[PDB]
Design a protein around this ligand. Structure first.
Ligand SMILES: Nc1ncnc2c1ncn2[C@@H]1O[C@H](COP(=O)(O)OP(=O)(O)O)[C@@H](O)[C@H]1O
Ligand SMILES: Nc1ncnc2c1ncn2[C@@H]1O[C@H](COP(=O)(O)OP(=O)(O)O)[C@@H](O)[C@H]1O
Ligand SMILES: [Mg+2]
Ligand SMILES: [Mg+2]
Lengths: 570, 570
């Protein structure tokens, strides 16, 4: 899974990989050659009292070490570049995938959890970094060191092998619980982050009710739990570090003891013993360094696994059934047939809805709060799929239509309006892009928005903050209408789009609505019944079920729920 | 400033530090014996071929090393405990302070930057992180190892001194740009995470308009900027590590060269040279290991500075003047006297407000969207201070009253209702640690919310997820009204709280308001304009000016702007 993903990123880049591998051979060879300095020092130069040869040999070994450092520098640069490319690919893929998940995923999870999942990729960046990724390369290169040590002294070789076996045993034994603890601490920190975002969002309410002390007391338990998980995870490192330190240091003492015994037995002389001890830094220290990074590597593995959970979720388009290519325009009659829907496993929201919106007409959806009108709009726009029944457009199931066409021919003006940080030109031309300014200004004029935008500085270029508060509530709601009309939708849905506008702007928008292009279906969802008295048909929702349908004239003519609503409200 | 905070948190733990210092002191003393071990190996045992002495001495030094490991383990446990305590103290202090910050702070800065600073405080956790402090502890005691080096030899000690000087020079020279690069990368990452948060928040609109690629492209650009900064930091680290490797390796080889020259001259025995070389692991290796972890303290320093940037900001209470203690009840005449307010030198939102609310009456403020009604309400609750004029309650300036009293006797029902994750009982009792169950049920019945609470699976215990996604808008408004009523305030402000309610619930609410103690002033900010006919006084707000004021019949008789609105909306 993730292993295949990493391999795929490495397929295009081979020259760097070949150079990285080949440069490591020179580095290890130079280090091995430079190890013998102490042997040459304690067998010939010191014993025979040679001075000039001492200087020459020292200069040569210093030169060798300089070349070794230069090779290490080159390899480090290449490794850093490779790791950066891989990290960029990983982050880009994760974001591109998370932006295409179904809506129920966003409903189920919280913002903080998704944020924490994303930014945990920084842990992966640390592991793939050049300084770390060098260490494993040395571990693969330790085979040459092992062969050389076996060639030097066979008896001493079966003393470092045992050390590596002990290292591996410790590594597995602490590999399991360390992974468990890192997963636990990541989950706990994700829980902490989510409650912090909620605290920031509702800062106004918290301040108004004086609940700062209560909120910080609530955050204690999450901070305390994070500290407990860290401390429990802390001792797993100390135990690992101490057990490794037992093997590493005591292994050196044992090796020195065995070498002294061999020298006393007249086997290899002291110089070869010192050479063996020094050369051991290219067979054990690379392994010892790698084991010391197991805490950091385990963190990256858990972070990647957590990212893997999201990437395994099927996208919105993947779930969709094969799309019929014979449909290009959503022109016709929108029909609901026994549609039932429930937000998860709770009580049903819509119960046996049967609708028939005539082609190129304006219809109305009215009802009390929480009666499923916005849910009907979302179902028509296919954010959620109906549990039972189907939605037909011109006699064709909405399931058998490409998702892009549905989301491009249908415009939504939600109950709220979301404004992205950028110029007003960018916000108006969201998604469409590459559109003539003549079209944008025409849409803004059509929505009675060209005036207030003209007064503010920079015209269609002023900067807007995240959910720009410098724009009034009515101003933002005018942008959404202009944005919807900008795409020339085939079906227009207005969800409380006339709630914060004066009579003049409402009349202007109505006049624009009655004459966009003709034969365009317009669905208006509103609570003020007075504004909706001049439409073709009106549907009344009563707790997820239509009760009476028709125009305004006959709906008041027959006495019922609509008549009571009209009389009470006016 | 920050370093003083660290010192203040170690004052209680006097005994713990002493144990770490004493245990650390014996650690280095036990660890020095390895040098004497190699000296004895290559000076006496090998030369004279003693076997039993070899075995005995090897066992003794193995025991010495075991004691050293045990002391290191105990010290590491203590260090981890201390680090966890300090970390917890710092992080909670920051969270509390950021919760106490003024309101205008949250308007300028997006949530993304704040959360980014919060979770970049994790690098301080990664920096202390137990074992890291042991390296500084060894470094500060590397002096005692160094002192005997001068006794053992002079020239080699001077060469090691030169090595230390080169370390220090390199550390400073690369210290400065490392801080620069770390600050740059943190800023870029904060921008990236803010963009991600903004993208996730408006996922519905992005999907509706098909703006996935544009958001994806912007995120790609932000990621590229982040990783360009990261690449610069990586090259800086590579250069640092390569220079440190040069100096360390040349230092080791020069130690060997000078020691060999001394041995040839007969200054010291070869065993003494080996002891000196192996003892450098307690004078230089602690220093080099500390320098290797420079990209862990500089990152921590930058993170701490970024947190202190927020911590230096004055809290809401600090900016307030000497609060009068003789005011306990916010009952009287609310008067606005030439109040002028602007949202950060942008434009005059309210100009010369001259308003007076009679004591214990119900007064409604009406106007077009963006006129500044919510701004008036927020001004009355000291979220912002007017740049000109003053607000008086019973003849006393509002800025001269205690902040806690102001926000405890004034209830605000915002246009958007915020529901915190948890039980319904928790949300209804926000701000009050506990009052009673009779009061809560009375308020819920008063606000007509008790009926739909009972229908829930767990009455007053149902778990509301995030922002009450399982609750309708009307239900959320009813909960907010009940929560405001439960406070039992002196001034009640309704900011279009009746927009989503139906006829019967609104009638119940308005009957409940009339049932108050006749001393609770009620301010009703409404947009419907038909919910005002039965109110004491009406203020018409236009372009931040009170143009018309009076009773409903009086205002209609005036045939002014209010009359136009009344005849247009009805
Ligand atoms: N994400 C969700 N999770 C659970 N329930 C939901 C969700 N969205 C809507 N509902 C339920 O659907 C019903 C109708 O909601 P909605 O259509 O948004 O408001 P309205 O009916 O006023 O347009 C509400 O009672 C609400 O409880
Ligand atoms: N946080 C803010 N930052 C900048 N400008 C703001 C902010 N909040 C409101 N404004 C501006 O001040 C005015 C206040 O209008 P507002 O009180 O929201 O009207 P209403 O009371 O009808 O909602 C708006 O025109 C808006 O542009
Ligand atoms: Mg709705
Ligand atoms: Mg308002």
């Amino acid at each position: 899974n993730m292993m295949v993903k990493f391999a795929g990123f490495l397929k295009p880049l081979k020259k760097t990989v070949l150079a990285i591998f080949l440069a490591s051979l020179l580095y290890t060879a130079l280090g091995i050659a430079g190890s013998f300095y102490i042997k040459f020092l304690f067998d010939d130069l010191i014993k025979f009292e040679k001075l000039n040869d001492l200087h020459i040999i020292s200069a040569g070994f210093a030169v060798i070490f300089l070349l070794q450092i230069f090779l290490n520098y080159y390899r480090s640069i290449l490794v850093t570049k490779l790791g950066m490319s891989i990290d960029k690919s990983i982050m880009m893929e994760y974001y591109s995938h998370v932006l295409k998940l179904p809506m129920n995923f966003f409903n189920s999870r919280k913002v903080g959890e998704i944020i924490s999942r994303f930014m945990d990729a920084s842990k992966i960046r640390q592991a793939i970094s050049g300084a770390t990724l060098t260490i494993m390369i040395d571990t693969i290169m330790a085979v040459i060191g092992g062969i050389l040590l076996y060639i030097q002294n066979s008896s001493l070789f079966f003393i470092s092998f045992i050390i590596i076996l002990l290292y591996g045993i410790i590594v597995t034994v602490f590999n399991k619980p360390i992974q468990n603890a890192n997963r636990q601490i990541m989950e706990d920190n994700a829980k902490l982050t989510s409650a912090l975002v909620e605290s920031v969002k509702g800062i106004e309410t918290i301040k108004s009710f004086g609940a700062e002390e209560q909120t910080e007391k609530s955050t204690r338990d999450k901070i305390e739990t994070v500290m407990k998980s860290s401390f429990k995870e802390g001792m797993l490192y100390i135990n690992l570090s101490s057990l490794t330190g037992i093997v590493a240091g005591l292994g050196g003492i044992v090796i020195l003891w065995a070498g002294a015994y061999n020298v006393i037995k007249g086997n290899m002389s002291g110089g070869q013993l010192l050479a063996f001890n020094a050369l051991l830094a290219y067979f054990l220290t690379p392994v010892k360094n790698l084991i010391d990074l197991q805490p950091l590597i385990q963190t990256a593995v858990v972070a990647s696994n957590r990212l893997g959970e999201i990437l395994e979720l099927a996208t919105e388009k993947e779930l969709r059934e094969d799309s019929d290519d014979f449909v290009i325009s959503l022109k016709g009659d929108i029909e609901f047939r026994n549609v039932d829907f429930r937000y998860g496993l709770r009580k049903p929201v819509l119960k046996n809805i049967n609708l028939t919106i005539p082609k190129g007409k304006t219809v109305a959806i009215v009802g009390e709060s929480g009666s499923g009108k916005t849910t009907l709009a979302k179902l028509l726009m296919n954010f959620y799929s109906p549990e039972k029944g189907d939605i037909l457009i011109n006699g064709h199931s909405i399931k058998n239509i490409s998702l892009e066409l549905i989301r491009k021919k249908i415009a939504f003006v939600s109950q709220d309006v979301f404004i992205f940080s950028g110029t007003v030109k960018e916000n108006l031309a969201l998604g469409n892009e590459n559109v003539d300014m003549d079209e944008i200004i025409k849409a803004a004029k059509m929505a009675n928005a060209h005036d207030f935008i003209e007064k503010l500085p920079l015209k269609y270029d002023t900067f807007l903050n995240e959910s720009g508060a410098n724009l009034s509530e009515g101003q933002k709601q005018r942008l959404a209408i202009a944005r919807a009309l900008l795409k020339k939708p085939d079906i227009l849905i207005l969800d409380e789009a006339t709630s914060n506008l004066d009579s003049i702007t409402e009349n202007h928008i109505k006049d624009a609505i009655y004459g966009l292009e003709d034969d365009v279906t317009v669905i208006i969802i509103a609570h003020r019944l007075s504004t909706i008295v001049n439409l073709d048909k009106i549907y009344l929702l009563k707790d997820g079920e239509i009760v009476e349908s028709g125009s305004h004239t006959e709906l008041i003519a027959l006495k019922g729920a609509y008549f009571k609503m009209w009389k009470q409200t006016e």
